[PDB]
């Protein structure tokens, strides 16, 4: 499979309720492995997966000091954002950032990412070339100019092609028994009468990892996308995920419907139907 590492930063102001909160979570693929929360009693970058616990004190100290600095930097960024949007200090606002690297199946850098949002709207993104910026608005153009002067893209490109890949490969090796193990979905079709005229067929996928999956209903071989209720893929709590897709079918027509499941843990795409 193709692997990725991502850090997610959130800074949330809250006037009248203390200084802005700053959190960091890091993921490899769909596995969270570190967290930082400025609201903690003694804020530290802390492990959230077993395979990172073996990193030495120097690791945790560096991650913590950078995150504590980031707490201060993003409080300053929130103050700056108020000036960039002519906003008052009375309202709550949010800066978000994500960055990291994707590895191809060959294990080399496939692409790098660094994007920010303000109040849930895209703000600035590092372009795929890892050397130019796309600003979303005239405020982000000010940031762009500052980052061009401070060679921010150059530092990011170096990180994303070097350390980010190297650390991701280390994590993948240390957590090989889980990070490099796909768990296929356990799949079933259930039947839920609605009336004497109609019933819901619900195609389930349970216990799969990673989260990426495709579930589709066909009727007589025609995809039923516009007629399928597809819930968002959801965490089970044990690292795996769940999803279902449901169609409303005329009673007695159930055997014309087939559920199709694609997941990288499967040797071949699965086809299921209701088995009464």
């Amino acid at each position: 499979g193709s692997h990725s590492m991502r850090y997610f930063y959130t800074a949330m102001s809250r006037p009248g309720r203390g200084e802005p909160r700053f959190i960091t979570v890091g993921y490899v693929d769909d596995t969270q492995f570190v967290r930082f929360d400025s609201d903690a009693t003694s804020p530290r970058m802390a492990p959230r997966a077993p395979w990172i616990e073996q990193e030495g004190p120097e690791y945790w100290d560096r991650e913590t000091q950078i995150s504590k600095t980031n707490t201060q930097t993003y409080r300053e960024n929130l103050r700056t954002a108020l000036r960039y949007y002519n906003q008052s200090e009375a309202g709550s606002h949010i800066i978000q950032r994500m960055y990291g690297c994707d590895l191809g199946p060959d294990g080399r850098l496939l692409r790098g990412h660094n994007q920010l949002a303000y109040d849930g709207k895209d703000y600035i993104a590092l372009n795929e070339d890892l050397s130019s910026w796309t600003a979303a608005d005239t405020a982000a153009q000010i940031t762009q100019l500052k980052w061009e002067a401070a060679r921010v893209a150059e530092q990011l490109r170096a990180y994303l092609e070097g350390e980010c890949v190297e650390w991701l490969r280390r994590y993948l090796e240390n957590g090989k028994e889980t990070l490099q193990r796909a768990d296929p979905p356990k799949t079933h079709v259930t039947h839920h009468p609605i009336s004497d005229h109609e019933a819901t067929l619900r195609c389930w996928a349970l216990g799969f990892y990673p989260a990426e999956i495709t579930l589709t209903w066909q009727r007589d071989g025609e995809d039923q996308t516009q007629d399928t209720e597809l819930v968002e893929t959801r965490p089970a709590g044990d690292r795996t995920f769940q999803k279902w897709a449901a169609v409303v079918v005329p009673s007695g027509e159930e055997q014309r419907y087939t559920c199709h499941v694609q997941h990288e843990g499967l040797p071949k795409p699965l086809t299921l139907r209701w088995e009464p």
Binding site: E63, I66, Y99
Partner: peptide, 10 residues
């Protein structure tokens, strides 16, 4: 491991 990009600012 996180990027050390302290000194970058909005």
């Amino acid at each position: 491991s996180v990027l050390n990009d302290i000194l970058a600012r909005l």
